[PDB]
Design a protein around this ligand. Sequence first.
Ligand SMILES: CCCSC[C@H]1N[C@@H](c2c[nH]c3c(N)ncnc23)[C@H](O)[C@@H]1O
Ligand SMILES: CCCSC[C@H]1N[C@@H](c2c[nH]c3c(N)ncnc23)[C@H](O)[C@@H]1O
Ligand SMILES: CCCSC[C@H]1N[C@@H](c2c[nH]c3c(N)ncnc23)[C@H](O)[C@@H]1O
Ligand SMILES: [Cl-]
Ligand code: NA
Lengths: 273, 273, 273
Amino acid sequence: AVKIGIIGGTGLDDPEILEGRTEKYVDTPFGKPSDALILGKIKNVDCVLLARHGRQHTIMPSKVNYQANIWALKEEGCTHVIVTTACGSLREEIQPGDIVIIDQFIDRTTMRPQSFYDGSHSCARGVCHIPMAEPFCPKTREVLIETAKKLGLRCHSKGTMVTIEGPRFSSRAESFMFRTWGADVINMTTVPEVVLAKEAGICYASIAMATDYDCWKEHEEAVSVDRVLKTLKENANKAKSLLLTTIPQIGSTEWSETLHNLKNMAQFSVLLP
Amino acid sequence: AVKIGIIGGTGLDDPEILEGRTEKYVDTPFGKPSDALILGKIKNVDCVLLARHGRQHTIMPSKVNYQANIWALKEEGCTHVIVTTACGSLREEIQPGDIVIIDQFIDRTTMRPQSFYDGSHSCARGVCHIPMAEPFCPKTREVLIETAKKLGLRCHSKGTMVTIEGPRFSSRAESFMFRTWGADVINMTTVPEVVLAKEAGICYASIAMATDYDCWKEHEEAVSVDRVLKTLKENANKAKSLLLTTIPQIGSTEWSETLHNLKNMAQFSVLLP
Amino acid sequence: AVKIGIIGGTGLDDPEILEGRTEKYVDTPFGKPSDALILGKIKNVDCVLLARHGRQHTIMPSKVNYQANIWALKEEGCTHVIVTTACGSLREEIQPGDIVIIDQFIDRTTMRPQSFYDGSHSCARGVCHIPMAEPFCPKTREVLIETAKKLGLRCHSKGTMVTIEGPRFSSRAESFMFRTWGADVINMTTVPEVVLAKEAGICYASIAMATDYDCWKEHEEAVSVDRVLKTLKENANKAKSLLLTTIPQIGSTEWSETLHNLKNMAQFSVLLP
Ligand SMILES: CCCSC[C@H]1N[C@@H](c2c[nH]c3c(N)ncnc23)[C@H](O)[C@@H]1O
Ligand SMILES: CCCSC[C@H]1N[C@@H](c2c[nH]c3c(N)ncnc23)[C@H](O)[C@@H]1O
Ligand SMILES: CCCSC[C@H]1N[C@@H](c2c[nH]c3c(N)ncnc23)[C@H](O)[C@@H]1O
Ligand SMILES: [Cl-]
Ligand code: NA
């Protein structure tokens, strides 16, 4: 049995993706999630949808309760979490509208709790040092990549996401610098979402959709809210189709060994007194 | 009509620059500014002076209320904010005493709110993603550059400021690293001052004065408080003369289109529910 | 007269190193230290041992009270602080079990107060900008290096420590990136411990013990809690022997000039109103 949490990003958090929808507000030891969980199905597969920024997009990236969001999805019984994220492209070949099935990140966030194990919650006791060598689930990523190909979508099979604190966009000097560091795409939301998913023993993968070229092409038009929303209006259907087609494939394959290994990695990362 | 906010940095916050001075303590939704606003004039031009660190230099860079400072200047009616900042030079050709009319930044701060739109203040509602491709006002920068030339001052027409959290100075490894990133000068105060000014729709420019070579020349003497204060004692007059000569030129030119464009960029950066 | 504070890191905080041990719980203006101070001697030399993470390793690196730890050691009369830290190796030639007598750092922490001079404590008044060009005491480092040679230990005479916030380990993209920045070893605890020691006018040095190769060798096994603990179990004796042999040598040499210079640097870094 699998159950797929879906965290929807900017313009990419469409409830209509699920059949048989039921709204469920929940609480967690880390506070309230961004919004109600939306329980439903894609074909025969149980899913739980959550809008990262709230359904009215009222929560800025620095203020998203990443701990509560991941905790809530885990408590609801999610084995997998597949997310969408709007992002800037830091590479000419990653064009706006392209999907990037990211496999690494570089953290530039500064304000965010990145662990459940903060010494303040009885539900998560001890000191946890989670490994981040492979932050994203390779098996889920492989299904996303194969499915994007079956759909004929422009899709990149790897990429490094730099996550900035925001909510401002990057300066041009920063944008240039991130390119030198080997970042391929830029957002404000991957970290610590991916980190907390790993601590929870959840298979996490991210559908990154390039919405802009940030500002590293000084000759070309630079990113803005309006530019991002426009690209999402034009391209969001691609992420919807990718989720709708990927999720039944995830449901049809065996995950016990993968989930056992993730559970072990999470459990063995915790030092108890 | 223009009104010029002046934020004075270390050793560079001299009230005597203004004629017809009146002290005005104010409050903001983000708390109190660093000190009283000093209202006055330079020739026919209305100005508002504020000491970044307080007039007795009692506020460390991490604790400066950047939100209140920018809010206060905006509420007083400032169209422009021109600031001074003491900084380390990361380039041999930027000598102590030189002015750098910075055009980019790299953020290394970690502790600081960078937006008015934090979801907690009724006066700034929504999620704001401000563009930072061009953080400083090019028209104001151009007047500063031309004026420095008219004054015969050693002045660099561009530069990237790395802003560190502080209050410690950088290690040598950090200083070396910032050079590789393309930083030209180093301080503790540009970010988030420049970011908040952009959200406020204010034309912001910075007169950076090199006070030291940080510590990247291992053979040469490294930065200290005493070294910085000495260089400022010797060179502060240059920033005073630059402000006094620049501000009347700003007053004599037309800003409506520039200010309209900045207002539009700020307004369109805000996502409402 | 010297008195040596010893801050023990992961698996490297063994009370049995001291003869004539007495437990002393203390308070500081910044709160409680990680655990009781352990007063004792190594040969004729007064020492004060403190477990960085608590004696049961219950305190994660982000939550260590670096201010209280350094304050407590200073108040107890420590002239020197020599610490141990487990770390990842970012260089092929730094093998697990090797000691690195680090001489520089790169800060990647985001959550931590780095100064005593926060404008909130009467015991530390003013704005302090401490120099970090030479963060570690070269004379103490030289004794550690010479002593490691006398013991026949694999020991590196310099190295740059990147300190990450944690508690997660780095991603592979981050690990690669830190190598390009010139970091040699990676931990979660050097900053701000070294910074606060400098503000306190204490001679600080660090015995870094490589416990893993982080994750930059994609072909090789990546870091985990279990891997780190295993390497420490096998190699901790080396740090114990190094401390036991170094400390009497520190006791036998003259420190007045070194300590006077550090005191002056600390005092002159403070700007009073
Ligand atoms: C309407 C929302 C305006 S775009 C800003 C939002 N979408 C992501 C984003 C898209 N493009 C970016 C870029 N170039 N830099 C940083 N973040 C982003 C980011 O995670 C943030 O939540
Ligand atoms: C008396 C004040 C001692 S210098 C420290 C102050 N002046 C700036 C500064 C000058 N030189 C620097 C340097 N090398 N690194 C970082 N910041 C600085 C910085 O913005 C800070 O507010
Ligand atoms: C049982 C404790 C598991 S290892 C984690 C602890 N030991 C240090 C460490 C060892 N190897 C590291 C690495 N590769 N990256 C970051 N930090 C570390 C670090 O300061 C942290 O306190
Ligand atoms: Cl950084
Ligand atoms: Na922070």
